[PDB]
Amino acid sequence: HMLTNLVAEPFAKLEQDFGGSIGVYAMDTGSGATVSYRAEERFPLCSSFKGFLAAAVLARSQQQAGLLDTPIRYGKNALVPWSPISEKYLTTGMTVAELSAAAVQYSDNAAANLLLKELGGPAGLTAFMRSIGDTTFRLDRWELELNSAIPGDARDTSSPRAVTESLQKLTLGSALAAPQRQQFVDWLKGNTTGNHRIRAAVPADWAVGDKTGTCGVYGTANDYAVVWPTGRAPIVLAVYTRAPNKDDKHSEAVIAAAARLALEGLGVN
Numbered sequence: 001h002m003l004t005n006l007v008a009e010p011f012a013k014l015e016q017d018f019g020g021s022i023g024v025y026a027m028d029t030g031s032g033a034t035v036s037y038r039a040e041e042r043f044p045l046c047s048s049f050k051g052f053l054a055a056a057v058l059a060r061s062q063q064q065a066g067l068l069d070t071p072i073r074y075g076k077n078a079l080v081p082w083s084p085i086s087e088k089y090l091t092t093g094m095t096v097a098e099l100s101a102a103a104v105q106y107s108d109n110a111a112a113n114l115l116l117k118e119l120g121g122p123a124g125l126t127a128f129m130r131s132i133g134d135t136t137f138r139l140d141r142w143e144l145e146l147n148s149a150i151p152g153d154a155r156d157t158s159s160p161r162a163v164t165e166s167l168q169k170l171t172l173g174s175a176l177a178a179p180q181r182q183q184f185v186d187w188l189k190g191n192t193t194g195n196h197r198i199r200a201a202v203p204a205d206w207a208v209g210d211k212t213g214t215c216g217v218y219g220t221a222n223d224y225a226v227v228w229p230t231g232r233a234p235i236v237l238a239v240y241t242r243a244p245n246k247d248d249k250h251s252e253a254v255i256a257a258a259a260r261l262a263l264e265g266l267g268v269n
């Protein structure tokens with residue numbers, strides 16, 4: 001609740017050094033204690049929607065047996081920049097399960113767009129988020145246009161608090177059936193793109209699943225994670241940044257430092 005104040009001045013100093021805005025929401029699932037800094041502001045999702053995309057695919061797999069094993073074929077024209085798995089299987093195709101793992105663990109853009117098409121596009125993923133009680137999340141566009149991160153534009157945004165609340169529901173709550181919940185957790189744990197973000201703030205003997213996002217403009221980048229500290233209940237957190245100038249650079253170091261301050265606020269140093 002009021003752990004925010006153990007670290008509200010440290011967050012203001014971090015954001016001043018960064019030269020932009022940092023949004024943080026962290027929840028101790030044991031006590032319900034929370035740390036919030038700009039937790040209600042909108043930040044561009046960038047690639048961070050791909051974790052929710054995989055969760056929506058897993059949800060649909062509860063109603064559509066065989067969905068995950070469905071082979072998907074795609075042409076050269078489906079490849080977009082940063083498609084490091086899907087480019088290796090262009091001549092063969094991949095299963096829905098494989099595309100979901102590529103979208104989560106490599107942030108694969110072709111895979112993301114192919115899975116968006118299966119769900120009925122950005123409105124389809126937005127519908128899934130509404131179905132679990134998230135009224136903040138909006139996806140509007142596809143890869144790569146959703147990365148514009150225009151100041152003041154609500155398109156393709158959510159808030160750190162809504163991302164944390166939704167992540168808790170999907171990974172630890174009852175939004176997915178048990179097998180689907182563990183598959184989502186296992187994809188997040190195998191992510192390869194987040195070593196310099198939240199993961200950099202967590203001890204090596206704690207389990208962590210995360211999903212990154214990097215727009216590449218307006219100092220805009222983010223990460224959300226579930227962390228299993230030993231001997232206590234899991235922590236769910238979201239760290240989002242943006243900056244006023246198109247040329248402003250994101251900082252992975254600032255996201256790690258924000259994650260450290262959120263864990264210090266919850267008393268999990």
Ligand SMILES: O=c1cc(CP(=O)(O)O)c2ccc(Br)cc2n1CC1CCCC1
Binds near residue numbers: 109144
């Ligand atoms: O779509 C992505 C995906 C990633 C990996 P994540 O978003 O951090 O999960 C990414 C990473 C660093 C940076 Br700079 C930019 C990125 N873009 C936008 C680019 C503009 C053309 C090429 C893709």
